[PDB]
């Protein structure tokens, strides 16, 4: 059983430098002119990935920066230049014998001190908005740090390319209608569409050009109140009934407003029993809710009845809807 000793156990390297990890073997790893020595790269919380095989061959999709050399008992892996995504633990491995072994590892981290600088964070609130045609509308934008007036405002129609609209916070790009307008400085900027035409319906972006890397805003969708729940009913699976339990789940997908009644129908008999409700929060996209009702009861009370329903009372529904199943 060949023992593979790695060196060093850890190394801190500056970006763009050379790093040379070693791996020494207790016995020769050579057979018929070949060194059965391979290198694996294991990033944090991740499975290993093959980098180099038979000491000097790169695997497909492995950058020309990784290289390996050595023979018999002395091997080396070199990364020149060292990049940010090269921080991982690196293992050498041998299959020169029936019983394969790995080395201890060499953890490589990019150093570390002096660190660097943060990246700018842009926010566009709300992520979605609605209004008529022929009205003035003000849109809002924000920056994490100072960008003075280095803010662009873009326009992307679905399945279309970004269209520059405003630059330097208040300037209008060429071909942009007078109805579009820009304002703001520092951390807070505003777009303004007076007497909005149907063409002004798209996702409105924003971008900082102060410090590298460049960063864009989340987004703001244009569209132009009631919503009935998409009512479904789920029966307990084959897996669950083997547990001696039966749970029927009434799904109420996307509804507005919140006021909604759900009533359980135990095979044509209305029975308020062993049930519990769950509910999502008021959305950002459509501000609708989602509700589940789970009537939990033993296979002793269930298996008898083969057909069950769910009564849903909502403003959106002219009269209550009752979703059923046949097993």
């Amino acid at each position: 059983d060949i023992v593979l000793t790695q060196s060093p156990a850890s190394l801190a390297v500056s970006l763009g430098q050379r790093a040379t990890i070693s791996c020494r073997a207790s016995e020769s790893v050579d057979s018929y002119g070949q060194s059965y020595m391979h290198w694996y790269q294991q990033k944090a919380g991740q499975p290993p990935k093959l980098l180099i095989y038979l000491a000097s061959n790169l695997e497909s999709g492995v950058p020309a920066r990784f290289s390996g050399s050595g023979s018999r008992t002395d091997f080396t892996l070199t990364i020149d230049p060292v990049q940010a995504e090269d921080a991982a633990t690196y293992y050498c491995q041998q299959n020169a014998e029936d019983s394969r072994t790995f080395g201890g590892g060499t953890k490589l981290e990019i150093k570390g001190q002096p660190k660097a600088a943060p990246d700018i964070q842009m926010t566009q609130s709300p992520a979605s908005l609605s209004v008529s045609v022929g009205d003035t509308i003000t849109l809002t934008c924000h920056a994490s740090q100072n960008i003075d007036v280095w803010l662009s405002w873009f326009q992307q129609k679905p399945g279309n390319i970004p269209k520059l609209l405003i630059y330097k916070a208040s300037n209008l790009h060429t071909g942009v209608p007078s109805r579009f307008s820009g304002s703001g400085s520092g951390t807070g900027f505003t777009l303004t569409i007076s007497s909005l035409q149907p063409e002004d319906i798209a996702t409105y972006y924003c971008q900082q050009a102060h410090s590298y890397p460049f960063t864009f805003g989340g987004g703001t969708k244009l569209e132009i109140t009631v919503a009935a729940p998409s009512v479904f009913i789920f029966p307990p699976s084959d897996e669950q009934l083997k547990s001696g339990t039966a749970s029927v789940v009434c799904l109420l997908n996307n509804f507005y407003p919140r006021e909604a009644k759900v009533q359980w129908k135990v095979d044509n008999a209305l029975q308020s029993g062993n049930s519990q409700e769950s509910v999502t929060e008021q959305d950002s996209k459509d501000s609708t809710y989602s509700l589940s009702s789970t009537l939990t009861l033993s296979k002793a009370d269930y298996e008898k009845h083969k057909v069950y329903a769910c009564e849903v009372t909502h403003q959106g529904l002219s009269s209550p809807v009752t979703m059923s199943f046949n097993r």
Binding site: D1, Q6, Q34, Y40, Q42, P47, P48, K49, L50, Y53, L54, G61, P63, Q83, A84, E85, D86, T89, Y91, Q93, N95, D98, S99, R100, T101, F102, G104, S152, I161, P162, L164, Y167, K168, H173, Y205, Q207, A209, Y212, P213, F214, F216, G218, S230, F232, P236, S237, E239, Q240, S243, S247, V249, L251, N253, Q276, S278, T280, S290, S292, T294, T296
Partner: protein, 332 residues
């Protein structure tokens, strides 16, 4: 007149060295920096890097530095973005734009853009999925299962490799396609490797479990000669201790347009983490808050609205208090 013409969509498989061009015309290519912006359907717009066509200078975002590679040829007036080893994280629209400047950067902005290039990365096809008992007592026995997909065990070799916390990778043993089994000389006595080619499954058993058998247990497939380990699973954690009172949890049951999901029932203690396609599905998802049952255990449901048997739907269930992590699919 001033245009940035981009190359077509890309059908890419994990590990490809995809190169997308963007030929610039109607202006002085040499006079303005060419930039690259990645989109993605659910993110927004992000900065990859920029290139200087006059000489060939570069500056990328720390993220895509060694990943993406910017090239320029002034003989063809084209800029290239060579992206190597991609994943389904690089599933985005790629625009090449120019940072046009007026009055010595008195005003600088992306005025002209390329039409975009849709780059799409495949869902592996070769899969290895370890699973086992999160917790187990000393002097006891461990029992793990490697579930393989997209290849057969009759002709592929499977390795069992563990990683103890703070220790290196330790090879346990292997099962060859012809049923030959090899073990680590040191742990030979305590290990048992076996397979079920029909069920597409590999198994490992380890006895006399002491606390230094606390490790992430992996299964890895051999490639062809030299037989290095070319495909690994995500791993399965096995913690070894005297007590875990009490004890287990998370039982995963399956559940116009189609609505589908999963039920995570009777687990203690709370919480349970749920996601779909390892994160590659956050659209029309409703991960309902948990409710304390009659049985004193906790329960929740995770649903997702999707169109109407091609796209794969898998929920990633994690109940940390029991060292449990499970993945399951849904069908009618």
């Amino acid at each position: 007149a001033v245009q940035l013409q981009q190359s077509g969509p890309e059908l890419v498989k994990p590990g490809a060295s995809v190169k997308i061009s963007c030929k610039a015309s109607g202006y002085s290519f040499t006079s303005y920096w060419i930039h690259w912006i990645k989109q993605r359907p659910g993110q927004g717009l992000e900065w990859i890097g920029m290139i200087d066509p006059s000489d060939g200078e570069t500056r990328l975002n720390q993220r895509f530095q060694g990943r993406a590679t910017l090239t320029v040829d002034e003989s063809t007036s084209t800029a290239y973005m060579q992206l190597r080893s991609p994943t389904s994280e690089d599933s985005a629209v790629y625009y090449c734009t120019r940072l046009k400047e007026y009055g010595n950067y008195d005003s600088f902005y992306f005025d002209v853009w390329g039409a975009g290039t849709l780059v799409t990365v495949s869902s592996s096809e070769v899969q290895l999925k370890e699973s086992g008992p999160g917790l187990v007592a000393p002097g006891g026995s461990l029992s793990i299962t490697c579930t393989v997909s997209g290849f057969s065990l009759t002709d592929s070799s499977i390795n069992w490799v563990r990683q103890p916390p703070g220790k290196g990778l330790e090879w346990l043993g292997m099962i060859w396609g012809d049923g030959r089994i090899d073990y680590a000389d040191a742990l030979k006595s305590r290990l048992s490797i076996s397979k079920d080619s029909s069920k597409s499954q590999v198994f490992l058993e380890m006895t006399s479990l002491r606390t230094d058998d606390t490790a992430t247990y992996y299964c890895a497939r051999d490639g062809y000669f030299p037989y290095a380990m070319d495909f690994w699973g995500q791993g399965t954690s096995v913690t070894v201790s005297s007590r875990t009172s009490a004890t287990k949890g998370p039982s995963v049951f399956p559940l116009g347009t189609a609505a589908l999901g999963c039920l995570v029932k009777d687990y203690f203690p709370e919480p349970v983490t749920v996601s779909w396609n390892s994160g590659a599905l956050t659209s029309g998802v409703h991960t309902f808050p948990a409710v304390l049952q009659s049985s004193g255990l906790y329960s929740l449901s995770s649903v997702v609205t999707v169109p109407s048997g091609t796209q794969t739907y898998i929920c990633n269930v994690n109940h940390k208090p029991s060292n449990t992590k499970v993945d399951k699919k849904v069908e009618p």
